[PDB]
Design a protein around this ligand. Sequence first.
Ligand code: HEM
Ligand code: HEM
Ligand code: HEM
Ligand code: HEM
Length: 107
Amino acid sequence: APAAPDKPLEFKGSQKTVMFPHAVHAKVECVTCHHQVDGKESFAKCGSSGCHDDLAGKQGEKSLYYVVHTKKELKHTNCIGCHSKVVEGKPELKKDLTACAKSKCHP
Ligand code: HEM
Ligand code: HEM
Ligand code: HEM
Ligand code: HEM
């Protein structure tokens, strides 16, 4: 598989840009986020054509917003989902990892 990016990268929606750092997630297997597609590995951008390419809508499988933010139980692990589990044991990180404003995702 390709190498994991060294520097934080721009993970964009239609209005906001969130800096995503791989370094901090080094203990997380790649596939956790870069889920398999049709039985094969995939490292394409989440919102590329044919994937979660609805960058404005907030509901549905095609919605990038939805797969990133929903707390519902999904087929694959997502951003808010794992962060919520993490803060159950580390409450001191609740604001930094799950808050809608003033968090590490949305400063
Ligand atoms: C808290 C539950 C929370 C809210 C609400 C929220 C809102 C939000 C908006 C309105 C956008 C802009 C969408 C767009 O540009 O089209 C947005 C985008 C991203 N967010 Fe968010 N967000 C909340 C929380 C968090 C947290 C705690 C993280 C990080 C784990 C996070 C991540 C992202 C990412 C990535 C984006 C860009 C991709 C996209 O969803 O379009 N948000 N968020
Ligand atoms: C595991 C060690 C791992 C690899 C390999 C990896 C690779 C990778 C690449 C090459 C990109 C760049 C994609 C591009 O076309 O620019 C990329 C981007 C993102 N990754 Fe990743 N990644 C690995 C692990 C992880 C883990 C564990 C997560 C989630 C916690 C994750 C997530 C992301 C996100 C988000 C992006 C941005 C994609 C976008 O649409 O902008 N990666 N990764
Ligand atoms: C990019 C790193 C990336 C993220 C983030 C992402 C998340 C995601 C979640 C959490 C699910 C489960 C949704 C649900 O259960 O309702 C999910 C599902 C699918 N994805 Fe995805 N996804 C990322 C990347 C990609 C890419 C690059 C494509 C397109 C090639 C893609 C496609 C799909 C499809 C289709 C589904 C539904 C089938 C499934 O595997 O669950 N995603 N994604
Ligand atoms: C989903 C693609 C996703 C995003 C977006 C995301 C963002 C994020 C940020 C911005 C941080 C803070 C970095 C900093 O300290 O400056 C962060 C930190 C942790 N994350 Fe995350 N994260 C996403 C996904 C995931 C997933 C799927 C998991 C769990 C499997 C996960 C876990 C963590 C953990 C652990 C941290 C570090 C907490 C700490 O001790 O500081 N993230 N994430």
